[PDB]
Amino acid sequence: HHSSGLVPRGSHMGSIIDAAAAAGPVVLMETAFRKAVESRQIPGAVIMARDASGNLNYTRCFGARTVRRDENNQLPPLQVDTPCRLAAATKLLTTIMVLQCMERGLVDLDETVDRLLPDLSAMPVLEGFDDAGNARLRERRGKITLRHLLTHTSGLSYVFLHPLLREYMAQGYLQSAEKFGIQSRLAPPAVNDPGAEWIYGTNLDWAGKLVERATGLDLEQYLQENICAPLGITDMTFKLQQRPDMLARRADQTHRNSADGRLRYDDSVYFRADGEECFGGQGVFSSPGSYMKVLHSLLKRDGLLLQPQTVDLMFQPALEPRLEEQMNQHMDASPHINYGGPMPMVLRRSFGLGGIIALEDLDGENWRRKGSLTFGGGPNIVWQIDPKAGLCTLAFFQLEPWNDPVCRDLTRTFEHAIYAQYQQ
Numbered sequence: 001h002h003s004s005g006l007v008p009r010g011s012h013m014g015s016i017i018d019a020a021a022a023a024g025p026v027v028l029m030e031t032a033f034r035k036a037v038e039s040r041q042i043p044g045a046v047i048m049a050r051d052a053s054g055n056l057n058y059t060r061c062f063g064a065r066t067v068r069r070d071e072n073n074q075l076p077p078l079q080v081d082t083p084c085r086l087a088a089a090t091k092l093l094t095t096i097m098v099l100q101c102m103e104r105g106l107v108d109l110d111e112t113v114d115r116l117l118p119d120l121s122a123m124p125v126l127e128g129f130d131d132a133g134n135a136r137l138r139e140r141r142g143k144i145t146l147r148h149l150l151t152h153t154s155g156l157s158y159v160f161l162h163p164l165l166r167e168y169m170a171q172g173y174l175q176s177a178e179k180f181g182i183q184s185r186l187a188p189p190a191v192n193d194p195g196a197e198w199i200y201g202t203n204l205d206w207a208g209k210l211v212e213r214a215t216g217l218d219l220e221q222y223l224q225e226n227i228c229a230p231l232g233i234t235d236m237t238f239k240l241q242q243r244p245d246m247l248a249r250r251a252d253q254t255h256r257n258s259a260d261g262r263l264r265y266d267d268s269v270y271f272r273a274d275g276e277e278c279f280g281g282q283g284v285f286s287s288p289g290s291y292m293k294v295l296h297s298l299l300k301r302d303g304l305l306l307q308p309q310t311v312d313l314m315f316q317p318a319l320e321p322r323l324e325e326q327m328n329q330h331m332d333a334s335p336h337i338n339y340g341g342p343m344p345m346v347l348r349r350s351f352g353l354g355g356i357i358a359l360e361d362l363d364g365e366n367w368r369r370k371g372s373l374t375f376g377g378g379p380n381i382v383w384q385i386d387p388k389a390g391l392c393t394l395a396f397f398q399l400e401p402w403n404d405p406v407c408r409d410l411t412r413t414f415e416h417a418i419y420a421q422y423q424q
């Protein structure tokens with residue numbers, strides 16, 4: 001029988017295997033993250049999941065915030081409070097700032113942009129190039145509204161994505177615009193008329209300008225007063241170079257080389273120069289912890305950033321049938337871009353305000369539900385908010401390029417496990 005004064009534990013091999021039950025989905029998933037760091041497939045990752053009740057408050061950090069060894073020859077850890085490059089995960093923040101302007105009566109979503117953005121309204125549409133080889137520009141048909149900007153239906157694209165714009169740069173129309181190695185996000189012409197199609201573009205850079213002009217504040221100040229302050233965030237900024245405490249702790253960017261699949265240090269412009277102006281499309285540096293505070297507040301509908309009914313607006317399908325059909329066609333045919341990250345390659349989607357909306361359950365009752373909102377950022381950052389499931393999640397890496405198979409697979413494994421164990 002048992003030893004006097006001591007707790008009755010397992011006393012031989014058979015009864016020690018029994019005393020602890022088998023490994024659940026979350027434990028197994030954590031092992032997969034640890035192995036991916038151990039085998040040098042990723043530098044590191046932070047994964048986080050929350051529900052509204054507080055019963056789910058899960059944060060795990062794996063690996064390093066860089067591939068460069070520090071002053072003690074160690075690889076410093078990626079932490080929940082490590083300042084990271086958000087890239088397009090900034091777009092959700094800028095969307096929130098716009099909606100706050102709407103709430104305070106500074107703007108109307110269906111108002112034309114001409115009043116606050118006459119510089120955008122004046123820009124032509126690039127229709128193509130004649131056989132002579134010169135640019136064929138024309139006047140826009142219809143007006144861009146704020147809701148066009150928030151839903152990426154304005155006609156704006158990104159130079160690095162659209163062939164017409166790539167040829168536009170090639171012909172030498174966009175050389176004088178850039179500063180400190182970062183491209184002038186505002187110079188290129190539009191490639192369609194507003195309302196014509198869903199096109200991923202510089203819409204939130206323009207929406208950020210609109211906020212600055214409507215409020216009389218620069219985006220950094222507006223961010224601090226209206227997103228950071230009410231959530232107690234002190235770690236979220238457009239102006240990393242002016243925050244020496246964040247600078248000393250920041251993640252380095254890592255890039256996976258096409259050839260040998262090896263990880264290398266990525267010495268890119270965004271970490272050694274702020275520029276002068278805040279870009280609402282891609283400019284924010286923040287910790288995963290601070291970002292989760294935003295997601296969680298939206299999930300809770302706690303009124304700290306926006307009124308519950310304004311938040312509900314973000315999750316409503318914004319596109320009419322023709323646009324919804326065209327967006328789905330484009331996304332299904334573009335797995336090389338993969339806007340939806342871990343989501344199935346073929347899925348019925350729409351766009352809300354702030355991200356892609358799933359119009360059907362991803363896998364019945366096993367994973368994300370209809371009505372869930374999602375987007376991401378370049379360095380394999382993925383966020384989602386799932387009101388019907390009562391969960392929000394984020395997977396933060398600092399690894400380019402976007403849509404890295406190892407990161408996507410780990411992200412899927414993380415979400416699947418959390419849903420399997422904790423979705424209510």
Ligand SMILES: C[C@H]1C=C2C=C[C@H](C)[C@H](CC[C@@H](O)C[C@@H](O)CC(=O)O)[C@H]2[C@@H](O)C1
Nearest residue numbers: 088160337339375376377378379400401402
């Ligand atoms: C929401 C997702 C949509 C995207 C659409 C097209 C691209 C692949 C995005 C990532 C581009 C990024 O990894 C590289 C670019 O920033 C390079 C450049 O701007 O010169 C991606 C990310 O923004 C995340």
